[PDB]
Structures are given as C-alpha cells and as structure tokens.
Scaffold this motif. Structure first.
Motif, PDB file in Angstrom:
ATOM      1  N   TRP A   1      44.953  34.060  51.597  1.00  0.00           N
ATOM      2  CA  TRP A   1      44.707  35.377  52.170  1.00  0.00           C
ATOM      3  C   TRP A   1      45.973  36.059  52.669  1.00  0.00           C
ATOM      4  CZ3 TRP A   1      41.003  38.089  50.742  1.00  0.00           C
ATOM      5  CH2 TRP A   1      39.707  37.589  50.570  1.00  0.00           C
TER       6      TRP A   1
ATOM      7  N   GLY B   1      34.207  37.298  53.040  1.00  0.00           N
ATOM      8  CA  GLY B   1      35.085  36.803  51.992  1.00  0.00           C
ATOM      9  C   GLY B   1      35.581  37.897  51.075  1.00  0.00           C
ATOM     10  N   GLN B   2      35.928  39.050  51.637  1.00  0.00           N
ATOM     11  CA  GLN B   2      36.252  40.225  50.838  1.00  0.00           C
ATOM     12  C   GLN B   2      37.217  41.100  51.621  1.00  0.00           C
ATOM     13  OE1 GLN B   2      32.970  43.002  50.016  1.00  0.00           O
ATOM     14  NE2 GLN B   2      34.601  44.544  50.002  1.00  0.00           N
TER      15      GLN B   2
ATOM     16  N   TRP C   1      44.827  39.865  47.067  1.00  0.00           N
ATOM     17  CA  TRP C   1      44.131  41.144  47.135  1.00  0.00           C
ATOM     18  C   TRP C   1      42.679  41.024  46.685  1.00  0.00           C
ATOM     19  CZ3 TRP C   1      46.392  44.756  49.861  1.00  0.00           C
ATOM     20  CH2 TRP C   1      47.789  44.795  49.937  1.00  0.00           C
ATOM     21  N   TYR C   2      42.099  39.829  46.791  1.00  0.00           N
ATOM     22  CA  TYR C   2      40.777  39.580  46.234  1.00  0.00           C
ATOM     23  C   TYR C   2      39.720  40.379  46.984  1.00  0.00           C
ATOM     24  CZ  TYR C   2      36.371  36.927  45.678  1.00  0.00           C
ATOM     25  OH  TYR C   2      35.060  36.558  45.481  1.00  0.00           O
TER      26      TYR C   2
ATOM     27  N   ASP D   1      41.412  27.677  49.295  1.00  0.00           N
ATOM     28  CA  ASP D   1      40.650  28.454  48.325  1.00  0.00           C
ATOM     29  C   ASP D   1      41.408  29.711  47.913  1.00  0.00           C
ATOM     30  OD1 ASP D   1      38.506  29.426  46.726  1.00  0.00           O
ATOM     31  OD2 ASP D   1      37.068  28.483  48.092  1.00  0.00           O
ATOM     32  N   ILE D   2      41.462  30.686  48.815  1.00  0.00           N
ATOM     33  CA  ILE D   2      42.136  31.958  48.575  1.00  0.00           C
ATOM     34  C   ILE D   2      43.281  32.079  49.570  1.00  0.00           C
ATOM     35  CG2 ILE D   2      41.920  34.459  48.582  1.00  0.00           C
ATOM     36  CD1 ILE D   2      38.941  34.033  47.841  1.00  0.00           C
TER      37      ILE D   2
END
Lengths: 180, 180, 180, 180, 180, 180
Positions: free
Chosen positions: B12, B94-95, B16-17, B9-10
C-alpha cells in the motif's frame, strides 16, 4: 535528520497486510464505542484532560480479547537530546489498522530505558484514535463540560521555584508532585 | 527541494490498486452524505469554520466500520523549518480512494514528534473531501449563513502583544488562549 | 525547464488503460449534464464566473458514487517561485478519462503545503471539462446573461493601496477581503 | 530545434492502433455532421469566425458519450518564448483517429500553467476537423454569408495605444477588452 | 540535407501494409468519383484554381465514414527557414494507399505551430489524387473552361507596395487581403 | 555519386514479391489498352506530345479500382542542384510490376517541397509504360499524324528575352506563360 537525535508468516515490521481490508463483527463495533466513564478521566495541571493508557489496554482486551491484538515496531528508536520517540503499528485479528509515532520525555540518561516504553503506550493511545476509542476526549464540547462540572482550578505552590501557578485538578483528587 | 526542510498482499505504500474501481453499496452512500450538525462546527478566531477531525473519524467509523478503513503513508516525512508535512492515502474496503498532503505547525524542536501526527489528521480531513464528507464547510452559502446566525464577532485582548483584535467565536463557546 | 521552479493491478501513475474505451450507461449521461443552478455560481471581483470545486465533487459523487472515481498524480510536483502546479488524471469506473495540469498561487513559504492541494482541486475542475460538467460556465451566452441579470458591478476600496477598483459581485453576496 | 523553446492494455502515447480501421455506426455519422447553429458562432475582432471549444466537447459527448472518447499526449510540451504547444491525439471507442498540434499564447511566466491546457483545447478543435465537426467554419461561402448577415463592422478605441481600429463583432454581443 | 531547415497492432509510422492490396467495394468507387460542383471551386489571385481542403475531408467522410480513414506521420517535421513540410500517409479501411509531402508557408516564428498543421491538410489534398478525388482540378480542359465562364480577371491595388496587379477572382466573390 | 546532389506483411520498400508473377484477368487487359482520345493529348511548345498524369491516375482507377494500386518509394530522394529525382515502384493487386525513376525541375529553394511530388507523378507516367497505357504517345506514326492534323506551329514572343520562337500548340488551346 534535523531532529537532534540518534538511533538507539507475515513480516509485520514492514508489511501493510489487512490495512482497511474488512470491518469487524458487530459486538466489536458496539463495545469499541462504549461511552467513557467520567470518574476515570484525569487531567494535567496545565488544563488538558486524558485517559490512563491502562484503560485503553483494558478496552482493547475487552473488545478483541487477550492475544487478539498487539503493537509492532515500525522504525528504529530515535532518541533526541530531551525526548525519545518511536513508530508503532497496531494489529488486531491479524489485520493492520494504523501506525502512529509515540513520544516520551526523559530528564536523565538512566531514564531512556524507562522512557522508551512509555512512548510505546503513547503510540497505542494515538492508534486507538482510529478505532474511535476515547473520542470524547477530543470533543471540545465534552472537554468544556467536563472541565466546568467535574474539575476545579486552584493555585498551587510549585516547589522548584516557589511560584504560585493556577492549575487544573479533579474535584476529588489531591495535588501531586511536579508541584506541592 | 526548494522547501527549507529535510526528511525525518498489497504494498500500500506505492500501489494504486482499486483507485476509482467500483462504487460502494447504498447505505454507505446515504450515511457518507449525512448533513452535518450545526452545533459541532467550530471556527478559528480569524474567521474560518471547520469540523473537529475526531468527528471525521467518527463518521468514517459509522460508514465503513472499525477496521474497514485506514491511512497509509505515501512519502517520507518532510520537516520544514517551521512546519511538518507528509503525504497520506486513504484506503477503504481494501480499495484506495485518494492521497493528500497534511501539514502541521510546530514552534519548538520537542514539538516535531507531537506535530507529525497532527498533520496526519489534517491529511484525513483533506482526503474526506473526495468522499463528500463535510461538503457544507466548503460551500460559501453555508459559511456565510452559519457565520451570520451561529457565530459572533468580538474584540479580544491578544495577550502576547497586548493588542485588540476582532475575532470570530461561536455564540456559546468562550475565548481560548492564543488570545485572552 | 524554462519554468523557474523545481520538483518538490494497474499502475495508474503511467498507464493509459481505458482512455476513451467505452461510454458509460444512461443515467450517468443524464446526470452528468444536469443544468447548473444559477444561485451557486460565484464570480471573481475581476469579472470571471466559476463554480466551487466542492460542487464538482458533489456532482461526481452523484454520478459515479463514492469510491467510483478518483484523482491520480501523473508527474512530480513542480513548484515555481510564485506558484505550484501538478498533473492529475481522472479515473472513473476503473477507466482513465483525462489528464490536466492544476495550478495554485502561494505568497509565502509556509503556504506551499497548503497550496499543493488546491491545485489538485483545480486539476479536477479542469478534467471535468471532458465530462461536460459545468459547460455553461464556458459558454459566452451564459456568461453574459448571468453577468447582466444575476451580478452587479460596484466600486470597492482595495485596502492594500487605498484605491477604488470597479469589481464584480453577486446581487446577494457581500464584499470579501482581498478588498474591503 | 529551431523553435526558440524548451521542453517543460494499449500504450496510447505511441501506439497507432485503430487508425482508420473501421467506420462508426449510423447515428454517430448522423449526429457528427449536425449543422451548426448560427447564434453560437463567435468571431475575433480581427475578422475570423470560430466556435467555442466547449461546444466541440458537447458535440463529442453527444456523439460518443461520456467516457467514450479522450485526448492523449503524443509529445513533450514544447514551450517557446512567446507561446506553448503540444501534440495531442484523439481516441474514440478505443480507436485512434487523428493527431494534431495545439498552441496557446502566454504573456507572463505565471501564465504557462494556465496556457498549457488551452492549447489542449486548441488541439481538440483541430482534431475534430477529421470528424467533420464544424466544417462550415472552414467553408468560405459560409464565412462570407455569416459575416454579411450576422456580423457587423465597427470602429473601436483600442485602450492600450488609444487607437481607432475597425473590428468585427456580432450584432447582439458587445465589445470586450483587448479593446474598449 | 541541402534544404535550409532542421527537424522540429500495425506500426503505421513505417509499415507498408495493404499498399495496393485489394480495391474497395462498389459505392465507394461511385462516390469517390462524384463530379465536383462548380460553385465551391476557388482560385488564387495568381490564376490557379483549387478546392478547399474541408471539402476533401467531407468527401472522404462521405465515402469511407467517420473513423474509417486517417492521416499518419511518415517522417520528422522538417522546418526550412521560410516554410514547413512533412510526409503524411493516408490510411483507409485499415489499408495504406499513398504517402505525400505537404508544405506550408510561414512568415514569423510564432507561425510555425499554426503552419505545421496546414501542411498536413496540403498532404491530404495531395494524397487524394491517388483516389481520383478532384481530378477535374488537374484537367487543363476543365481549368480553361472554368476560368473562361466562372471567373473574371480584374486589376487590384496591392496594398503593401501600392501597385496595380491583374488578378483572378470568381464572379461572385469579392477581393480579399493580400491585396485590397 | 557523380550527380551534384544530396539525399533529402510485405516490406514493399525492398521486396520484389509478385514481379511478373501472374497476369491479370480479362477486362483489366481490355481496359488497360483502351485507345487514348485525341482531344486530351497535350504538347509542349518545344514539340513533344504527352498525356496529363491525372488521366493516367484515372485510367489506373478505372482498371484496378480505388485502393487496388499504389506507388511505393524505392530509394532516398536525391536532390541535384537544379532538379529532384526519386525511384518509385508501382504495385497493383498486391503484386509489384515495375520500378522507375521520376524527375522534376525546380528553380528556387522553396520549390523543392512542391517539386518532390511532381517527380512522383513522372515516375507513375513512366511505370505505366509497362502496363501499355498510353502506348500511342511513343509511336512515331501516331506522333507524326497527331502533329500534322491536330496541332499547329506558330511564332510566339518569349517574354523573358523578347525573342520570337516557333512553338507547337493545339488547334483549340491558347498560348500559356513560359512565353506570351
């Protein structure tokens, strides 16, 4: 590189999916922080308390269920001249949680195949720190109290060099062999 | 490069989401700034107070829940001749929140595998500064008051060189071994 | 280049999104300019007053909330022979505000890993100037009044060279060690 | 090139968007030209009056609000052998206004990291000229009147060379150290 | 090239959009040609009258409003051995009006960073000629009348060479230092 | 090339749009041919009458309005060893009218930056010939009549060579310095 060693749906080897994505449901939170029993906490002769890794596996099976979690390799197995290490990530409910580095000591060549799994257990023991499992083992208050009420300190004859070393041992266990 | 060390997905690892994107809900704000208990604040013999990192993990688990947060590597592990460091980022819900650099001291080669995780803990200890967890440990008023009412200052025989060093220790703990 | 040093959704590393785009809502404006308490303003022995950076973090958490703001690297960490610096940008509510350069002093090699985070704090201390946080620390009227009513000037024995230096200190704090 | 120095949504680094595009609404116009108080106008010992840059930041925050404006780099930081300069542009309400060049003086190498931000402040002080903020500081009538009713001219012992220099100072402030 | 110097939505750096496109509305025309007050017109000691550039900025802010106009660079900054110049264009209401060349005199190297902005002001002073602002300063009738009723001609001791030079000065101002 | 010099929506630099396309409306025609006042017509000492260029700017502003016209460069600035020239085009109401070549005399190097704008004014003075502005200045009848009723002819001591030159001057102005 400075280490004196050499290498031996979702691509979990490199994926970061689910890392800190959503928390688990309630009873998982309750039984992940279940207080550890005092009787099944062991201690090295050098004075460091610990919990057997099979108990970590049992707790993980109780919290997530069989097949609900697993360990994934994250890097090639690096074998140093006197130890073996590898990076392992913990996946639960299809969701990555943490990645740690596990180590194991070997004293002979025929021992690398046996040791390369022990470090895996070590890695799991480390990854569970993120889940809060066995937190009291890292609390100095708990360590001190447990060592003053449930452990004793006795001289032992270390057989290899015929020395007398003052070691830690539980009040019901007996001495095992790296010593007497 | 000037550091006398080498790499070991991301997405990590580099994303920098979510950095400073939206704040968390109310009770997370309440329990992230819960005042720290005085009894579980330890101190080096050199005179620097701190909180055990397992307590940071416990606070993070209480605020976000198990599986609601994690630590992600952000750079290759750089091992200097006398220490090991690595960059770690903290992800919650998720941040992404912050990225810090953790360090750990090792005195032998067989100790890099053990040390390379300790620095991780250090990094977490640093990243929690962004969340406001353990703010009083960096308040000079709190440091001074705690050192004058909950800590004492005593001579100790440093065993390696048979010297007498004046060290800090809590009023209920005992002396541990880098010294006596 | 002339510096005697070497490098060590939205791509926040290089993006300029939100820079001066829209102002924040009312209570953020109110609590960002909340007057600073006199008791928690410290001062160097050389005569420069300041606020602890943990108080800046606390103010930012009070104004924006946990997870509502963050610091992003903007350039590679440049380590000079006697100091370490890095560029850091402040993001709040998914909106860039300012970018500053933070510095930190180190006296030994093993100290770069510890120092490279301190400069980060410095950068935040600088970026908050844009938000108006701690404005009175840069007002000469406030500096003069605070130094004449809440600080005293005393000789101290600087231990390294056994000199007598006239230093600034608050009326309730005691002398700390770079000196006596 | 002749300078004896070396380099150290909307791409605001190079974009010219909004330059002189539409004017701001009424109360911004009113509070941008608010007459400056006489008591907070300082003056060099050499005879040049000025306003502290924190007061410019305060005025900008009062007019546009926190997060409603910012400073963007426009060129690489050029460090000359005795000073540091950089180009900075002022953005308000997502609209470029002006670009200026800020300068700062440094006397030691360890001082470039500290100086490279001061010039930024200088640049802001310059860019506000476009907004009309602090216009009276550049009015010779105001300068003359302020120097004849709110400032005095006194000899001072310049400590470095033990000279007597006639300097300007406000009627309530005291002498500071580049001199006595 | 013959100059003894070296370089140091709408792309306003090179665009010619809006040049002489449509005129402005009525009250802009009225207040752009507002007669200049006699008291705020200064004069060099050599006999040339002028208006301070801050008054040009004030007039532009009164006519177009804050943010309704700006200055854009049009060419690289060319620094000659004894002066610095640059081309600047004036934009009002998203509409280019004129481009001029501004100059500034510097006497030391550390003075180019300060001078390179002064020429900008000069350029604005020149560009306003297109708007008709300060027309009377270029009317020989106004110059002669102002010099015969609001200015006097006095000997002064030029301090550098201890000469007596007959200079122009207003009837209320005093002598400033390039001279006495 | 034979000149002893060197170079220093609608692309108005090269476009010919609107050249002689449609005429302007009535009152523009009326006020473009408004008879020039006799009192504001000056004359060189050599015997050539002219109008100050600021009056041309005033007439253009009265006819077209502020922002309704402009001057655009048409070629690179060619600087000859004793003069500076450039081609300039006049645009009114988004419509090109004429292109002329303006010249200016400089006597020192530091004077090219100042002179390169004067020639611009010259170019405008020339381009207005197309509009019919100041036609009487090129009418020999008007020149002769104006020189016989509103100008006188007097000897003057040219200070550089201590010569007596018979020069032209208005009946109310006084002698200025290239002479006495």
């Amino acid at each position: 590189s400075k280490l004196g060693g050499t290498p031996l749906d979702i691509d979990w080897y490199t994926s970061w999916y689910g890392l800190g994505m959503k928390p688990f449901e309630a009873k998982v939170q309750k039984d992940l922080i279940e207080p550890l029993d005092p009787k099944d906490i062991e201690i090295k002769p050098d004075g460091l308390i610990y919990l057997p890794e099979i108990k970590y596996r049992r707790i993980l099976n109780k919290a997530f269920g069989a097949g609900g979690w697993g360990l994934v390799p994250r890097s090639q197995t690096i074998v140093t001249s006197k130890l073996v290490t590898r990076e392992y990530g913990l996946i639960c409910h299809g969701q990555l949680i943490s990645v740690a580095r596990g180590e194991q000591d070997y004293f002979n060549e025929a021992g690398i195949p046996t040791a390369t799994e022990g470090c895996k257990s070590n890695a799991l023991m480390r990854c569970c720190k993120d889940l809060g499992v066995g937190s009291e083992l890292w609390d100095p208050v708990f360590i001190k109290k447990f060592k003053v009420d449930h452990c004793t300190e006795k001289f032992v004859e270390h057989v290899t060099t015929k020395r007398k070393k003052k070691i830690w041992l539980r009040k019901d266990r007996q001495v095992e062999y790296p010593y007497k």
